[PDB]
Design a protein around this ligand. Structure first.
Ligand SMILES: Nc1ncnc2c1ncn2[C@@H]1O[C@H](CSCC[C@H](N)C(=O)O)[C@@H](O)[C@H]1O
Ligand SMILES: [Mn+2]
Length: 686
């Protein structure tokens, strides 16, 4: 269940969170903020000799645990939750190196008797949340060890933990009883489905228990010589879903002839792709006439030979490569005798954030974004903090290198993303961000928000086929992983900056008559107050589209206001997005640009998080030819197809919006429709 994964999540939360809390407590982070409370990042890193980059990662984690509040001046303060640091006894760090492999084999004595008593005791803590963190340090190593021999199973053919010495039985039983992994029914231990499930999924946390050495020198990472030191399966299920779609397309003639996975690793991804294609798709039934060659790419020869072994009975090829240089790939593929790169489907899985960092190259594009409120945290080889806007700018030119190699078959990219501390806390144990974000930042990997990554592709002409693109975690209001099947499109989409006001005013006049143009004052307001609420569609360096939006407290706040008082609907902590306007030059209408721009903005607002719906008040264009009938009977009309007659309301409704009501005298100056504005809402379903 999700609830059990949450228990797993908070076990692995402490595995990472505890070393750093202790490290911060020893250098005096908490004692400091006990004084001089309001402090900046730079204020502290100077007063502590910290590595600003890695130390910021610690702050994000601590804020995400709501031990620190970060004010609008960006300075931190303690919270009441932060007082519990005093009772985390230091010696718990000894858990990371105990010989539990041998222990289960009966050759370490009563190794885990003193801890298990302290875990049965609430680690002498009056806080169940931290007691689960501490339990992690014991729990994580055990499950890994218990998993090498599937030791956690019910008591039918192997009575639960019956192969083991008397003491191991006694100690583990006392523990599994405390943690609820087993019940002593009928005077004999029998696992609980929690215990069973805790042992089955035991490898989710274990796999990333490889953080141990960095965690042991985490005090170095934060305050000393940091330089010396350096799991859903439906991620891939949906990835396979979109592969079938690609290899069931109309003519086999036009399916990709190559599938190149950047970041082969062991090659498991490629092999799963081929079996999906082999046994399920249409291509799999015509491989003798339309061969398909897998291609593996990776910069470590180690994993290059691991995929030669994995793909060994499969038509494949292997070569060395790097994400940062997609142009060497076509040339290496040229060297390996592939002269039709346009017939390659490109895929990759969770590596763009592990690219070798290039500094940003287009300094004007750097400064446009230097005020946007990114909440990426990233660290340089010197251990200092990289400004978010530099990283994102870096990301864009990284994506542009690839956009210039992407072909008709597109670019299918899974990727992982970080989260705002305020959101991590709200969903602390529903997501694994706290430890994953904390480590991937300590490890000099580069995580950005999902909305920002998708935007980064947008600004270079890469756009997700929303049909084959999926978001995760599906049923929560945050995006932590994205499956995007980026298409290359002949345009670009980007944020509107104040520099764009001249053209956006010119835009507003070419799209509407004077009595319907948006006030220049309004447009200025939209840009200044909604930096990430304004999307622009650029073709050949000119703006040809623009969708405006802001955040509102509710749809009920709207539906009770006139167009003139919209600016007074703005609420920064709103759970709904107001669609302010959708302007497309008449020269370039009837092309789908407006349709695509609309679809993109909706998905952009889904990845931001915390937005249940997108609503707006639109106009009718052809009521003035039917005004004899009421609006509501006109809105009911249908064109030659099964779509609404009116092209404006038609456009939003076809795009999935539902007409929610009519607003009387919303736009009085709109004489054609008698001042009536038609409210709309978009599903926005997960
Ligand atoms: N910058 C880069 N360019 C290309 N491949 C990269 C890369 N950085 C890392 N990789 C690849 O990503 C993979 C590491 S993850 C593979 C390990 C495997 N999943 C396991 O758990 O056992 C390796 O193939 C490595 O070569
Ligand atoms: Mn990584």
């Amino acid at each position: 269940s999700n609830a059990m994964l949450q228990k797993i999540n908070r076990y692995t939360h402490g595995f990472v969170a505890v070393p750093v809390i202790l490290a911060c407590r020893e250098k005096g982070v908490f004692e400091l903020l006990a004084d001089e409370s309001p402090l900046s990042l730079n204020q502290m890193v100077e007063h502590l000799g910290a590595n600003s980059g890695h130390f910021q990662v610690a702050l994000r984690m601590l804020e995400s645990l709501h031990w620190l509040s970060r004010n609008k001046e960006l300075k931190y303060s303690l919270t009441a939750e932060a007082a519990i640091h005093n009772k985390i006894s230091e010696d718990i760090l000894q858990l990371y190196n105990l010989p539990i492999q041998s222990y289960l084999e009966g050759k370490q004595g009563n190794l885990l008797g003193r801890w298990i008593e302290r875990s049965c005791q609430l680690w002498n803590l009056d806080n169940p949340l931290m007691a689960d963190f501490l339990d992690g340090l014991l729990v994580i190593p055990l499950l890994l060890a218990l998993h090498k021999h599937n030791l956690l199973a019910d008591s039918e053919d192997k009575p639960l933990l019956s192969s083991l010495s008397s003491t191991v039985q006694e100690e583990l039983g006392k523990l599994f009883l405390h943690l609820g992994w087993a019940d002593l029914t009928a005077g004999r231990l029998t696992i609980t489905e929690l215990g069973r499930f805790m042992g089955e999924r035991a490898l989710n946390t274990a796999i990333v228990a490889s953080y141990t050495p960095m965690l042991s020198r985490i005090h170095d990472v934060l305050f000393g010589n940091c330089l010396s030191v350096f799991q859903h399966q439906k991620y891939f299920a949906d990835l396979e879903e979109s592969i079938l779609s690609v290899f069931n397309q109309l003519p086999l003639e036009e399916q990709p002839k190559y599938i190149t996975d950047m970041g082969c690793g062991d090659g498991t991804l490629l092999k799963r792709v081929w079996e999906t294609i082999q046994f399920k798709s249409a291509r799999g039934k015509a491989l003798e006439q339309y061969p398909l060659r897998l291609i593996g790419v990776d910069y470590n020869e180690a994993s290059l030979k691991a995929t030669t072994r994995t793909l060994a009975s499969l038509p494949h090829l292997v070569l060395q490569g790097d994400i940062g240089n997609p142009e060497q790939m076509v040339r290496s593929l040229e060297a390996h005798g592939i002269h039709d790169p346009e017939n390659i489907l490109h895929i990759r899985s969770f590596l763009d954030h592990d690219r070798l960092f290039i500094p940003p190259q287009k300094r004007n594009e750097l400064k446009e974004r230097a005020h946007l409120p990114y909440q990426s945290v990233c660290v340089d080889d010197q251990g200092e903090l990289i400004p978010p806007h530099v990283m994102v700018q870096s990301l864009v030119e990284h994506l542009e290198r690839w956009s210039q190699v992407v072909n008709k078959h597109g670019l299918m990219i899974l990727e992982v993303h970080c989260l705002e501390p305020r959101v991590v806390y709200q969903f602390l144990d529903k997501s694994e961000n706290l430890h994953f974000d904390a480590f991937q930042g300590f490890s000099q990997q580069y995580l950005v928000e999902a909305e920002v990554f998708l935007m980064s592709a947008a600004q270079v002409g890469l756009f997700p086929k929303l049909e084959l693109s999926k978001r995760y975690p599906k049923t929560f209001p945050f995006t932590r992983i994205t499956l995007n099947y980026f298409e290359k499109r002949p345009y670009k989409i980007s944020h509107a900056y104040l520099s764009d006001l001249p053209a956006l005013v010119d835009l507003e006049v070419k799209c509407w008559p004077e009595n319907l143009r948006a006030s220049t004052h309004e447009i200025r307001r939209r840009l200044e107050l909604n930096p990430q609420g304004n999307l622009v569609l650029i073709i050949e360096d000119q703006i040809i589209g623009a969708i405006y939006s802001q955040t509102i407290t509710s749809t009920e706040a709207l539906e009770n206001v006139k167009y003139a008082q919209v600016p007074t609907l703005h609420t920064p902590q709103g759970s709904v997005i107001q669609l302010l306007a959708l302007n497309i030059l008449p020269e370039f209408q009837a092309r789908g640009l407006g349709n695509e721009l609309r679809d993109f903005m909706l998905y952009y607002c889904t990845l931001k998080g915390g937005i249940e719906s997108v609503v707006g008040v639109t106009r009718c264009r052809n009521y003035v030819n039917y005004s004899q009938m009421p609006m509501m009977e006109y809105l009911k009309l249908h064109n030659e197809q099964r779509q609404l007659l009116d092209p404006i309301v038609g456009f939003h409704v076809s795009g999935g919006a539902e007409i929610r009501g009519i607003i009387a005298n919303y736009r009085p100056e709109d004489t054609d429709n008698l001042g009536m504005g038609i409210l709309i809402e978009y599903n926005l379903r997960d």
